[PDB]
Write a protein that binds this ligand. Structure first.
Ligand SMILES: [K+]
Ligand SMILES: [K+]
Ligand SMILES: [K+]
Ligand SMILES: [Mg+2]
Ligand SMILES: [Mg+2]
Ligand SMILES: [Mg+2]
Ligand SMILES: [Mg+2]
Ligand SMILES: [Mg+2]
Ligand SMILES: [Mg+2]
Ligand SMILES: [Mg+2]
Ligand SMILES: [Mg+2]
Ligand SMILES: [Mg+2]
Ligand SMILES: [Mg+2]
Ligand SMILES: [Mg+2]
Ligand SMILES: [Mg+2]
Ligand SMILES: [Mg+2]
Ligand SMILES: [Mg+2]
Ligand SMILES: [Mg+2]
Ligand SMILES: [Mg+2]
Ligand SMILES: [Mg+2]
Ligand SMILES: [Mg+2]
Ligand SMILES: [Mg+2]
Ligand SMILES: [Mg+2]
Ligand SMILES: [Mg+2]
Ligand SMILES: [Mg+2]
Ligand SMILES: [Mg+2]
Ligand SMILES: [Mg+2]
Ligand SMILES: [Mg+2]
Ligand SMILES: [Mg+2]
Ligand SMILES: [Mg+2]
Ligand SMILES: [Mg+2]
Ligand SMILES: [Mg+2]
Ligand SMILES: [Mg+2]
Ligand SMILES: [Mg+2]
Ligand SMILES: [Mg+2]
Ligand SMILES: [Mg+2]
Ligand SMILES: [Mg+2]
Ligand SMILES: [Mg+2]
Ligand SMILES: [Mg+2]
Ligand SMILES: [Mg+2]
Ligand SMILES: [Mg+2]
Ligand SMILES: [Mg+2]
Ligand SMILES: [Mg+2]
Ligand SMILES: [Mg+2]
Ligand SMILES: [Mg+2]
Ligand SMILES: [Mg+2]
Lengths: 88, 101, 73, 119
RNA sequence: UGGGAGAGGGUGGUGGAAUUCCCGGAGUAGCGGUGAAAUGCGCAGAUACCGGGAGGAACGCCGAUGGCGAAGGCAGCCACCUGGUCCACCCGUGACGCUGAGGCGCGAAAGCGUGGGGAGCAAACCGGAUUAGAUACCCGGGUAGUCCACGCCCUAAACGAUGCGCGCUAGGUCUCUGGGUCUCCUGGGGGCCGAAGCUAACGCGUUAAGCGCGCCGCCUGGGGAGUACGGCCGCAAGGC
């Protein structure tokens, strides 16, 4: 699972400023953490389709936010990505 | 790590030696698997509600511990390898949900 | 009718999650290993649901029975 | 012939027959009867009277072996169960106790169609 | 951020009840089955009873009128891995939203392929009865299959036969699950009865079939026909 600390880590590592918890980057970073974990969970347990639907929603929610960034601040977008190493 | 509660029922016909030789490997395996023993109880002999292993009784053990979850299954898998060990029930600890209180 | 008394009212402060206290747990099984119904246990949807879990655990351990013989008929 | 005195009486009631078996204090049969053992050959075996008779045949044949007191154990739910019990009680044998031990699965094997349609 | 309930999903373990078979004991003439019977099983000793073992499949009571899931669906118990979701605080972002042709994935049962496994059940099938006949209903047997692993198939009365989202419009009553200053208020579900209103009626009624806006799907008398042709998909059966 994802431990509170494990989580608090990314939140710091990505927050635009102190106390920032709801940024597009923070959210995209958190989703990216969950996604990757679940993706690992599914490399094994390939028959766990109910959980795969959760993966599908996450990935969707992500592209959606990222889409917003690209449209709002083309830079932060390129930076958020390069940093996370998303897409590819 | 997480807090568990190992339950072990073993042959009720063991001389002080055999009983200690089992508790030996029990205590051992635990250590070998990160079983930090917070507490313990040994109500020993008790009248089973039904015969387990043809025997109308069993000798009980109990250990409140903390260990690497990913090994809780292996730990218990191990405890079972014994012949004198007739039951192994590990359980994630829980706040006592009182009632009628 | 189901009015002999509810097993809950007949008890004191007890932990529903204690799968070893066969002393009280046993008072929740019928004249057979059968788990008593809420109409008789006096417990609630949630309490009753935890009892079951606990009882079954005690049954696996050997502390409680799965079934008993009726004595009459 | 072996002298046993006290033992067990097993009533296997069903919708087609009643078969009684008397055994020593630890399960080994001494004698037995059933609607077929006595006269009745087909449908009649199920009837309670047949049960009554078989029950008596069982006890009688058992007293020869020196039986006196029995511990009854009922299995089955047939049209004739309760009669075999009243039969043994008036048979002479002393009914020390009665216990229903009809087996019931905790849901194991798919029943015959005849016993399904049961939600 | 802090908490909660849950047969939500995947994996590995493990428990007891019962059935069948095998071994031992004891015991003897029938058992079984039906409306009644017979086929069948039993002196190579069955049925009924006790003890031991093997194996597969399912999970009694608790279960509800209950819970969870997008649907299909999901009930011993334990551990791990994992999805969704509800509540409180009012903390962060700042319209980032809704719907959704096509695409992609999931999709009960039966069925297919390869390899396993088979207790019980059981299409076909082999017999016994019934009957005017009885290619049925009832009875004795019984193969595929039902179970597992991998691939396929993609259908259903897949139903609430009610597409998704949001806003608005009395209340009473029961219930599940949170929070509260725990008469009872609050939030999210599950039922029932009902204001206004709607409806051909039946009924629906804050879980709309009411009053509205957004987007998708679909209908246009019955038969021919979900057929023919064509295309796509499928090993096939067949599907669209
Ligand atoms: K014969
Ligand atoms: K009307
Ligand atoms: K065609
Ligand atoms: Mg008969
Ligand atoms: Mg579950
Ligand atoms: Mg068995
Ligand atoms: Mg034998
Ligand atoms: Mg046969
Ligand atoms: Mg013969
Ligand atoms: Mg013959
Ligand atoms: Mg002979
Ligand atoms: Mg046996
Ligand atoms: Mg076998
Ligand atoms: Mg639901
Ligand atoms: Mg359904
Ligand atoms: Mg969860
Ligand atoms: Mg704020
Ligand atoms: Mg601002
Ligand atoms: Mg959509
Ligand atoms: Mg769009
Ligand atoms: Mg399917
Ligand atoms: Mg299938
Ligand atoms: Mg197959
Ligand atoms: Mg096969
Ligand atoms: Mg059959
Ligand atoms: Mg006719
Ligand atoms: Mg004929
Ligand atoms: Mg048949
Ligand atoms: Mg329906
Ligand atoms: Mg209501
Ligand atoms: Mg409500
Ligand atoms: Mg409510
Ligand atoms: Mg009106
Ligand atoms: Mg009308
Ligand atoms: Mg009218
Ligand atoms: Mg109404
Ligand atoms: Mg509406
Ligand atoms: Mg309408
Ligand atoms: Mg639509
Ligand atoms: Mg159409
Ligand atoms: Mg036409
Ligand atoms: Mg047509
Ligand atoms: Mg068709
Ligand atoms: Mg083709
Ligand atoms: Mg082709
Ligand atoms: Mg077809």
């Amino acid at each position: 699972p994802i431990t509170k600390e494990e989580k608090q880590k990314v939140i710091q590592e990505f927050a635009r400023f102190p106390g920032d918890t709801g940024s597009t980057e923070v959210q995209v970073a958190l989703l990216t953490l969950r996604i990757n974990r679940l993706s690992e969970h599914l490399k094994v347990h390939k028959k766990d389709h109910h959980s795969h639907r959760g993966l599908l929603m996450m990935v969707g929610q992500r592209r959606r936010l990222l889409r917003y960034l690209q449209r709002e601040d083309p830079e932060r977008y390129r930076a958020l990505i390069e940093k996370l190493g998303i897409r590819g | 790590m997480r807090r568990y509660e190992v339950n072990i029922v073993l042959n009720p016909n063991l001389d002080q030696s055999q009983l200690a030789l089992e508790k030996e490997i029990i205590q051992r395996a635990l250590e070998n698997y990160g079983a930090r023993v917070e507490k313990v109880e040994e109500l020993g002999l008790r009248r089973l509600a039904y015969p387990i292993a043809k025997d109308p009784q069993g000798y009980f053990l109990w250990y409140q511990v903390e260990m690497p979850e990913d090994r809780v299954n292996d730990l218990a898998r191990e405890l079972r390898i014994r012949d004198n060990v007739r039951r192994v029930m590990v359980v994630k600890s829980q706040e006592p949900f009182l009632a009628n209180a | 009718p189901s009015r002999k008394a509810k097993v809950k009212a007949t008890l004191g402060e007890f932990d529903l999650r204690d799968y070893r206290n066969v002393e009280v747990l046993k008072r929740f099984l019928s004249e057979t290993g059968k788990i008593l119904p809420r109409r008789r246990t006096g417990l609630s949807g949630k309490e009753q649901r935890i009892l079951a879990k606990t009882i079954k655990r005690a049954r696996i351990l050997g502390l409680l029975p799965f079934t008993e013989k009726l004595v009459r008929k | 012939k072996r002298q046993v005195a006290s033992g067990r009486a097993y009533i296997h009631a069903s919708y087609n027959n009643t078969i009684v078996t008397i055994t020593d204090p630890d399960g080994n049969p001494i004698t037995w009867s059933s609607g077929g053992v006595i006269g009745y050959k087909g449908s009649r075996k199920g009837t309670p009277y047949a049960a009554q008779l078989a029950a008596l045949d069982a006890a009688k044949k058992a007293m020869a072996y020196g039986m006196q007191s029995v511990d009854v154990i009922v299995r089955g739910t047939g049209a004739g169960r309760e009669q075999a019990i009243r039969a043994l009680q008036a048979s002479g044998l002393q009914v020390k106790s009665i216990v229903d031990d009809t087996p019931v699965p905790h849901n194991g094997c798919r029943p015959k169609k005849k016993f399904r349609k049961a939600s």
